Design a protein around this ligand. Structure first.
Ligand SMILES: Nc1nc(C(=O)O)c(CCc2cccs2)s1
Ligand SMILES: [Zn+2]
Ligand SMILES: [Zn+2]
Length: 231
């Protein structure tokens, strides 16, 4: 079963096999007085691993590397952070100390700097305009437009039809929004429509927080977001 928030003590990381060579990582952390789960992705990249997003903080990210070493045994050589918040870049300094080359878009690196968050070393080119896609080893990176944040990226694994939506996509059980401090509530439905247009064959859809699903999470997120702007 996919692990749930109450099953992961803060500081522990679970790995979940989605497909051959594709895993999610699941961790937990406190935000504004409660503990939340958070998802990232791991994708086999030949003899190496590509990591999508930290495990939300330095302690969790160290535990992530240890679990990967224990369970998979291939080196994590590159990481991509899909936006500038701490559940995506928090732990970048641990990754770098461990020998991982860290990447994000120029906008994400800039916003992390402004926020006083950790800053990935390398800039991903070719993602500056809504609708842009670039290949990055075994995945495609896609900038759908502003949504949860103005820099948020999604990731697609063609070999397995896996769409990682990051924080732009909500789990089915989540019916209210927040944290939308950095969100663009007007653009978010449009950004989701771009994801749908570009990845219509996605079979597994992973939200930034919570249980995976299918393309129904896209329509579900639009409904939640619109309800939030309706009142
Ligand atoms: N670091 C965090 N980010 C978010 C987000 O909204 O992206 C959090 C809330 C996530 C969840 C709310 C209800 C179930 S999961 S915490
Ligand atoms: Zn965020
Ligand atoms: Zn988040």
């Amino acid at each position: 079963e996919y692990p749930t928030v109450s099953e992961i003590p803060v500081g522990e990381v679970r790995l979940y096999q989605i497909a051959d060579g594709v895993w999610s990582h699941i961790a937990t952390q406190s935000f504004d007085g409660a503990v939340y789960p958070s998802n990232g992705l791991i994708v086999r990249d030949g003899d190496e691993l590509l990591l999508i997003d930290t495990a939300w903080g330095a302690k969790n990210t160290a535990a992530l590397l240890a679990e990967i070493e224990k369970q998979i045994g291939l080196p994590v050589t590159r990481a991509v952070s899909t936006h500038f918040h701490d559940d995506r870049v928090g732990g970048v300094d641990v990754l770098r100390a461990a020998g991982v080359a860290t990447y994000a878009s120029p906008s994400t690196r800039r916003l992390a700097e402004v926020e006083g968050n950790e800053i990935p070393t390398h800039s991903l080119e070719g993602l500056s305009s809504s609708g842009d896609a670039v290949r990055f080893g075994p995945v495609e990176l896609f900038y759908p437009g502003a949504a949860h944040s103005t820099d948020n990226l999604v990731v697609y694994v063609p070999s397995a039809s896996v769409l990682y939506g990051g924080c732009a996509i909500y789990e089915l059980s989540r019916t209210s929004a927040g944290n939308v401090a950095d969100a663009d509530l007007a653009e978010w439905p449009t950004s989701i429509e771009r994801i749908q247009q570009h990845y219509p064959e996605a079979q597994f859809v992973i939200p930034g927080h919570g249980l995976p699903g299918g393309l129904d999470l896209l329509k579900h997120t639009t409904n939640v977001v619109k309800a939030h702007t309706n009142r």
